[PDB]
Each structure stands twice: as structure tokens, then as C-alpha cells.
Symmetry: C3
Subunit: 158 residues, 3 copies
């Protein structure tokens, strides 16, 4: 599907490149789409609400504060996302149950693994501006990620 | 054989969690058991003594000081430990011959790999109070490890 | 083809050990040969000159200044390296297109992956004393590498 390196060559300055802090935890090597942003901390309630919805062509970008203390995505949440056809997830924080994740048809990029699950309370905000890995992400931007890296573009690419 | 995240979800607070500093190098993705502790540094003497003994039902939890300059476990020592029925090893230190270690039916968690072997002089204690990764380990505690993380408790679980 | 642990046991002090800074990106788990050093920075033009020449029995040792912002080697450059029989590349810097790199019959050790390509200007020097990861490299020196680590020696180790 997507080659981030080839797309950097083609699009040059028209993309930003996230710092190399992520690893792929999902069964899908590359993914792309238009992004919905979320900002939260050690609480995934809001991603539950968002992952219920259809996600075909969308990528969920999550600012979790870079917490590696508690996990934002586990098997339950990722199955939801696969079943609603979400292209992929970018988690500035942690994931859980990694053996189940490497088996699901979704990209998942994250910082680390930790077995403790996040709170479920529903705290946080969506469609807001977030910043991590030296990149600010606006809901509506286009992201592309593979095992090489993650890039962000205002306008779609191809 | 173990899903550390499920475990965190049932036991809640009754479980302690190790900082995400370790990776799996053994052929067993997940293992658990009652722990015997060792404290040593860039010497694997004691370990030979322990792993010569039958380890069925036990996990060797080794505070090697976090050294990544010398490897405490290689193929030979790991094979010994397989043959002696040891469930798994956890090294706050380094291993060696990782290609060989992947093929061996024992759990192995370490911080890093390094081709230089530990000395064999014998120095170190065992059954002593050790601490690393944000966790205190006591001989007779129970540990549970998968590709997601490492948990430790006083009583057995499940 | 090579076991670095083993060679440290046989040769001890006659070998220098590189710090655990690198990962494997190539199809070969292990490799070795006589090194030709390069010193450059976010530019890979010289790498193209060098890898056009026959590399059987040889390892390109690249001091790219540890930059993880620009990738010195990509699929295209590594395929040229395979075509001219090079044993391996050790990059003190980044690589690109990691999925393609895993399938090419050559050894590649590097620090990280970044999607952005290096400049092709050609700046840099060849066959010069370079230092990184606690080791100094001279053309003529011999390198042996695997998933456990990387070592350097003055004379061949067969």
C-alpha cells in the first residue's frame, strides 16, 4: 500500500516527518488515511466512543501524553477498530497484549507496551490540535505510516 | 500460557508491574513461576550453580546490575537451564547468542545483547532482596511474563 | 556464517566490541569481511561511488555522524550493494524502506529508520580513521556482526 520513503522523495517539503519514536504493533505494515485527533491521558473511554464509528479511510491519532505507565489499546479495543474498518492507530503512549495485536488487520503505531489497562472514564477531547514527535496534527490531515516511519500532510497524496 | 494484561485486569492492585525495560529472547513467549533471586555483576558463576539444579516450577530472577557490557546468559547456560526444567529467566543485564536462544524452550527476558561473556569466578549472593525496574524481588515471589510485560506477586495467581 | 559471542571467547582482547547501538535491517543475520571506511553526514553520494565497485569479502563501515534525520541507505542503494557482492554495511546513522531491506541478501546494521533520504551531493571522505560506538575503524580492519552484536579485529578471524 504505502511507502513513506518514496512519498518523502516525491513530496519533499510538503510533508512533516514524525520523530522516530514508534513501533508497529499491528498486523498491517503500512496504512494511511485522513486523521481524527484525540487528546487524553491514561484514559481510553473517548477512543471507545470513536472506534464504534465507521473508520474506513480514517486514521486515529491519539495524544496520550507519552505515558508508558498505562496502556491505551488492548485486544478488545483493536478488534473493535478492525471490525469498523479503521485503517490504523497512532498512539503517543502505550499498547497492550502484543501477540494479539500482531494478528489484526490494522496498523498500530505506539511507544511501548505495558500490561496495565488505562482508565475508562471518558476524559479528554477530540478533533483538537495535538503535538508530539515534533509534529502538530490537525483533525482532517493525512497520515501515512509503515515500518520505516510516519508522515503527515495537509492534503491527501496517493 | 500467560496473558499478563488479563492478569492486571483481574488482580488490579494485587499485582506489581516492572518498568518496560525488557525484551524476550527465549523461545517461550510467556512463562511464570515461583522466583529464586540472584545478585551478581558481570559474573555468571552463581548462575551455573543454580541452573545445574532442577528448576521445574521456578523462575530465575537475576539482578546483574543492568550491565550491558557483559553477557550473563549464553546458549550453553540456557541449554543447561532447559534441560533442568527451569521455566524462565529474567536478566537485569545482558544475554548472548540470541539466535540460538530463540530456538530454546525457556522464557528469557533481558535488557540487551553483548557478545562478551561474563567471568565465571563465582562471586554474588542468592535468595537476597533485589530491586530493579521499579520492583522489589523476593525469593518465593511469583512472576509472570509475556511479550507485553512482566508482573510480580506474593501469592500464586489463577 | 559468524558467531560473535564465540569469537570473543576465542580471541578475547584481540577484538574490540562496538557498543550495543545497532540493529539488523538486512536479509542476513550475520556477516563479515574486510572494511572500507567512509565518513559523511546526511549525504550518500560517496556511498554510491563505493558500492558500484565489487564488494565480495568486504564490509562498508559508514560513520554518518549518528544522524537519525536522514537515511543513508535505502532499497535502491542496498540492491546495488547486493549486485556488487558486498557482505554488509554498518551504518552509524539511519536506513530507510526497512521492509524491502529485510529481503535483500546482505547484512545491514544501523541505528534507526527514517523516511527522508540523504542528499546525493557526494561530500565526504573515504578510507579514513573513524570512531563510533567506542571503537575506531581503519580500512583493512575486519568486522564480524550478528544479532548479538558487532566486533572489530586487526587481523582476520577466518
Amino acid at each position: 500500500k504505502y511507502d513513506t520513503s518514496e512519498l518523502c522523495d516525491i513530496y519533499q517539503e510538503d510533508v512533516n516527518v514524525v520523530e522516530p519514536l514508534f513501533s508497529n504493533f499491528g498486523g498491517r505494515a503500512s496504512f494511511g488515511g485522513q486523521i481524527i485527533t484525540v487528546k487524553c491521558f491514561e484514559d481510553n473511554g473517548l477512543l471507545y466512543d470513536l472506534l464504534e464509528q465507521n473508520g474506513r479511510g480514517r486514521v486515529l491519532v491519539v495524544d496520550g501524553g507519552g505515558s508508558v505507565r498505562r496502556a491505551l489499546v488492548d485486544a478488545e479495543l483493536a478488534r473493535l477498530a478492525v471490525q469498523n474498518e479503521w485503517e490504523g492507530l497512532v498512539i503517543y503512549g502505550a499498547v497492550r497484549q502484543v501477540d494479539d495485536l500482531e494478528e489484526l488487520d490494522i496498523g498500530i503505531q505506539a511507544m511501548a507496551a505495558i500490561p496495565v489497562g488505562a482508565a475508562g472514564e471518558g476524559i479528554g477531547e477530540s478533533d483538537v490540535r495535538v503535538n508530539f514527535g515534533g509534529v502538530t496534527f490537525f483533525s482532517g490531515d493525512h497520515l501515512y505510516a509503515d515500518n520505516t516511519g510516519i508522515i503527515l500532510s495537509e492534503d491527501p497524496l496517493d
